[PDB]
Amino acid sequence: GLMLDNLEVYPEAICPFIPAVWNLVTGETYGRGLVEDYAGDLAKLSALSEALALYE
Amino acid sequence: MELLDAVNTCLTALGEARVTSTDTRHPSVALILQTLATKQKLLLERGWWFNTQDEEMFPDLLGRIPYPAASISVESLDGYNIYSKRNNFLFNNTCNTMYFTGPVCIRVTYNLDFEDLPESVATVITYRAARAVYVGDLGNDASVQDLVLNEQQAMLLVEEQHMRNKKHSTRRRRPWGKYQNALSG
Amino acid sequence: MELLDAVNTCLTALGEARVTSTDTRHPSVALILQTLATKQKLLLERGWWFNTQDEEMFPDLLGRIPYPAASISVESLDGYNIYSKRNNFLFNNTCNTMYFTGPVCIRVTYNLDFEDLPESVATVITYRAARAVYVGDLGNDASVQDLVLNEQQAMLLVEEQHMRNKKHSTRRRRPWGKYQNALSG
Incomplete structure (x- = not known):
């Protein structure tokens, strides 16, 4: 609970904190990544890699 | 399929006259019944879609686990352990x-x-018992070629029915589940 | 499978009448029992999934190690040493x-x-004893072609069951364990 003072005020243009998003669906709060669009191929590739390792 | 029907079929195949009750004191009926019982016990040993279930057993005060009286075979499902039946009790083969x-x-x-x-299983059992009796009681004549053929035809239907009931599929493997989970977001 | 059932099966295959007790004084029963015992002893020599265990033995005061009475074969597990049975005691073949x-x-x-x-093992033993007796007592007729066929069918099921129980896998080799350990950090 204890405060530490250090109050600071910045105009909105020169604020030092910058949140960013890659893809933002309207209505939500957090964005989405590029990898999410191609999950099926990676999932289908991992199992084949496992089978190849078993044969090796 | 009543036992009387199977007994009458065996008697007709053997050439003797038909009967009316399985309790008749004819001496061939006892042999027929014993052969039928033995063949039935042997056939079902492997396991099919109607006589296989999973169960859990608990130990006694001393630590001995009995097994069901009607069972024919036992197998383990705990890792790589091995179990077997001995002295009317389960034996731990992995630890002696x-x-x-x-x-x-x-x-x-x-x-x-x-x-x-x-019906299909009963036909197979009946036609196996009939041959087992005919060959041992009258020799290997040329009429056994029909009994063997009937047995094979019945076995084909039995296998087809078992394959139909089990409903095996490639969608039940876990990689498919993982793929479907991945295809969601 | 009670011994009486096997004795009755052998008698029926041989053409004689069935019996009620294994203690009956008929002279063929003794031969049947001896043949069954010999075949049972021979069959299990190689070892299966229900009669194989590892054990450790200790020496006596003099230094002689006895072996279990019920055993049929012995083998070593210490490096490249060789052991064998001789004079009711273990023999060190590598050092004479x-x-x-x-x-x-x-x-x-x-x-x-x-x-x-x-059941599958008992059927094989019974059908081997039946042929061994029939051929030696009545000659090689055309009816042995059914006994051999029954024996082969039973042996197939025996082998399938043994393969099922052992649960061999390629994941139990140590290279897989090393690979899994590497895939962790």
């Missing part, structure tokens, strides 16, 4: 001991009444 | 001596009662 510490999981194959068996 | 210095590890194959054997 008879006393257990807790419950276990095992596969069991049960023996059922002749009436409850499907 | 009978006196040991400490405990040893060896594989043992045990002989069990006929009742405890699975």
Whole structure:
């Protein structure tokens, strides 16, 4: 609970904190990544890699 | 399929006259019944879609786990452990001991009444018993080639029915589930 | 499978009348029992999934290690050493001596009662004994072609069951364990 003072005020243009998003669906709060669009191929590739390792 | 029908079929195949009750004191009826029972017990040993279930057993005060009376075979399901039947009790083959510490999981194959068996299984059993009796009582004549053929035709239907009931599929493997989970977001 | 059932099956295959007790004084029963015992002893020599265990033995005061009475075969598990049975005692074949210095590890194959054997094994034993008696007592007729066929069918099921119980896998080799350990950090 204890405060530490250090109050600071910045105009909105020169604020030092910058949140960013890659893809933002309207209505939500957090964005989405590029990898999410191609999950099926990676999932289908991992199992084949496992089978190849078993044969090796 | 009543036992009387199978007995009459065997008698007709053997050439003797038909009967009316399975309790008749004819001496061939006892041999027919014993052969039918033995063949039925042997056939169902492997396990099919109607006589296989999973069950859990608990130890006694001393630590001995008995097994069901109607079972024909036992198998383990705990890792790579091995179990077997000995002295009317389960034996721990992996540790060479008879006393257990807790419950276990095992596969069991049960023996059922002749009436409850499907028609296809009953035909196979009847035609196996008929040949087993005819060959041992009258020699290997040229008429056994029909009994063997009937047995093979019945076995084909039995296998087809078992394959149909089990409903095996490639969608039940876990990689498909993982793929479907991935295809969601 | 009670011994009486096997005796009755052999008698029926031989053409004689069935019996009620294995203690009956008929002279063929003794031959049947001896043949069954010999075939049972021979079959289980190699070892299966229900009669194989590892054990350790200790030396006596002099230095002689006895072996279990029910065993059928012995094998070594210490490096490249070789052991064998001789004069009711273990023999050190690698050093040509009978006196040991400490405990040893060896594989043992045990002989069990006929009742405890699975159905598939009992059928094979019964059908081997039946042929061994029929051929030696009545000649090589055309009816042995059914006994051999039954024996082969039973042996197939025996082998399938043994393969199922052992649960061999490629994941139990140590390279897989090393790979899995590497895939962790």
